[PDB]
Amino acid sequence: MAAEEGVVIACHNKDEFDAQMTKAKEAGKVVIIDFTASWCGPCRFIAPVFAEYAKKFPGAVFLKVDVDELKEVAEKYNVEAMPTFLFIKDGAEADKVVGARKDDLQNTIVKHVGATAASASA
Protein backbone atom coordinates (compact mmCIF):
# COMPACT_ATOMS: atom_id res chain seq x y z
CA MET A 1 0.00 0.00 0.00
CA ALA A 2 1.67 3.18 -1.26
CA ALA A 3 -1.34 5.11 -2.55
CA GLU A 4 1.26 7.18 -4.41
CA GLU A 5 3.73 8.52 -1.85
CA GLY A 6 6.47 11.12 -2.18
CA VAL A 7 8.33 8.91 -4.64
CA VAL A 8 8.58 8.70 -8.43
CA ILE A 9 4.87 8.89 -9.25
CA ALA A 10 3.42 6.38 -11.72
CA CYS A 11 0.81 8.21 -13.80
CA HIS A 12 -1.39 6.13 -16.09
CA ASN A 13 -4.04 8.44 -17.53
CA LYS A 14 -2.38 11.80 -18.18
CA ASP A 15 -4.49 13.50 -15.52
CA GLU A 16 -2.00 12.07 -13.03
CA PHE A 17 1.00 12.87 -15.21
CA ASP A 18 0.06 16.55 -15.10
CA ALA A 19 -0.38 16.50 -11.32
CA GLN A 20 3.42 16.53 -11.37
CA MET A 21 4.41 18.30 -14.59
CA THR A 22 2.53 21.23 -13.07
CA LYS A 23 4.07 20.84 -9.61
CA ALA A 24 7.41 21.81 -11.15
CA LYS A 25 6.87 25.12 -12.94
CA GLU A 26 5.02 26.63 -9.98
CA ALA A 27 6.72 24.57 -7.27
CA GLY A 28 10.10 25.71 -8.58
CA LYS A 29 11.64 22.29 -9.19
CA VAL A 30 12.83 20.27 -12.19
CA VAL A 31 10.67 17.60 -13.82
CA ILE A 32 11.53 13.93 -14.36
CA ILE A 33 9.11 11.72 -16.28
CA ASP A 34 9.90 8.02 -16.65
CA PHE A 35 8.19 6.91 -19.86
CA THR A 36 7.97 3.28 -20.99
CA ALA A 37 6.62 1.21 -23.88
CA SER A 38 5.04 -1.70 -22.00
CA TRP A 39 7.81 -3.97 -20.72
CA CYS A 40 10.15 -1.28 -19.41
CA GLY A 41 12.93 -3.79 -18.82
CA PRO A 42 14.39 -4.24 -15.32
CA CYS A 43 11.55 -2.63 -13.36
CA ARG A 44 13.19 -4.44 -10.45
CA PHE A 45 16.96 -3.96 -10.42
CA ILE A 46 16.67 -0.17 -10.52
CA ALA A 47 13.20 -0.16 -8.96
CA PRO A 48 14.49 0.82 -5.49
CA VAL A 49 16.58 3.46 -7.26
CA PHE A 50 13.96 5.56 -9.06
CA ALA A 51 11.24 5.76 -6.41
CA GLU A 52 13.91 6.13 -3.73
CA TYR A 53 15.58 8.80 -5.86
CA ALA A 54 12.41 10.87 -6.27
CA LYS A 55 12.58 11.57 -2.53
CA LYS A 56 16.38 11.78 -2.37
CA PHE A 57 16.02 14.76 -4.72
CA PRO A 58 13.58 17.29 -3.22
CA GLY A 59 14.42 19.59 -6.12
CA ALA A 60 12.22 17.59 -8.48
CA VAL A 61 8.71 16.17 -8.82
CA PHE A 62 9.57 12.86 -10.49
CA LEU A 63 6.92 10.63 -12.07
CA LYS A 64 6.44 7.60 -14.31
CA VAL A 65 3.98 7.25 -17.19
CA ASP A 66 3.07 4.64 -19.80
CA VAL A 67 3.43 5.43 -23.51
CA ASP A 68 0.75 2.83 -24.25
CA GLU A 69 -2.32 4.49 -22.74
CA LEU A 70 -1.38 8.17 -22.76
CA LYS A 71 1.48 8.10 -25.26
CA GLU A 72 0.08 11.49 -26.26
CA VAL A 73 2.57 12.71 -23.66
CA ALA A 74 5.59 10.86 -25.06
CA GLU A 75 4.66 11.93 -28.59
CA LYS A 76 5.03 15.53 -27.44
CA TYR A 77 8.54 14.99 -26.09
CA ASN A 78 9.47 12.43 -28.74
CA VAL A 79 10.32 9.31 -26.74
CA GLU A 80 9.15 6.64 -29.18
CA ALA A 81 8.75 3.85 -26.62
CA MET A 82 11.00 3.15 -23.63
CA PRO A 83 11.75 3.94 -19.96
CA THR A 84 13.01 7.34 -21.11
CA PHE A 85 13.39 9.55 -18.04
CA LEU A 86 12.41 12.56 -20.16
CA PHE A 87 12.85 15.83 -18.27
CA ILE A 88 10.89 19.08 -18.31
CA LYS A 89 12.85 21.91 -16.70
CA ASP A 90 10.85 25.14 -16.55
CA GLY A 91 7.98 23.29 -18.20
CA ALA A 92 9.45 22.43 -21.60
CA GLU A 93 12.25 19.91 -22.08
CA ALA A 94 15.66 19.85 -20.40
CA ASP A 95 16.66 16.41 -21.67
CA LYS A 96 16.10 12.67 -21.30
CA VAL A 97 17.90 9.61 -19.93
CA VAL A 98 16.37 6.17 -19.40
CA GLY A 99 14.94 3.92 -16.70
CA ALA A 100 17.69 1.32 -16.98
CA ARG A 101 20.88 3.22 -16.16
CA LYS A 102 22.02 3.51 -12.54
CA ASP A 103 24.84 5.76 -13.74
CA ASP A 104 22.95 7.95 -16.20
CA LEU A 105 19.95 8.73 -13.98
CA GLN A 106 21.34 10.11 -10.73
CA ASN A 107 23.78 11.86 -13.07
CA THR A 108 21.05 13.73 -14.93
CA ILE A 109 18.95 14.56 -11.87
CA VAL A 110 22.03 16.30 -10.46
CA LYS A 111 22.44 18.46 -13.56
CA HIS A 112 18.76 19.44 -13.56
CA VAL A 113 17.77 19.02 -9.91
CA GLY A 114 21.27 19.09 -8.46
CA ALA A 115 22.06 22.36 -10.20
CA THR A 116 25.67 21.21 -9.81
CA ALA A 117 25.97 18.04 -11.88
CA ALA A 118 28.56 15.97 -10.02
CA SER A 119 29.96 14.67 -13.31
CA ALA A 120 32.61 16.65 -15.18
CA SER A 121 32.10 20.24 -16.30
CA ALA A 122 33.98 20.82 -19.55
Q: Which of 19, 43, 49, 94 is catalytic?
A: 43
For residue 121, what are the contacts with CB-CB under 8 A and spacing of at least 6?
none
First to last CA, the chain: 44
Q: 87 forms bridges with which residues in the sheet? A: 32, 95
How was this structure determined? It was done by NMR
Domains, the chain, with CATH or none: 8-115 (3.40.30.10)
The yes-or-no answer on residue 11 being catalytic is no
- Please spell the DSSP secondary structure of 27-92, one letter per residue: TT-B-BEE--SSS-S-SSSSHHHHHHHHHH-TTB--EE--TTTSGGGHHHHT--SS----B-TTTT
Q: Which of 24, 31, 32, 40 is catalytic?
A: 40
The yes-or-no answer on residue 40 being catalytic is yes
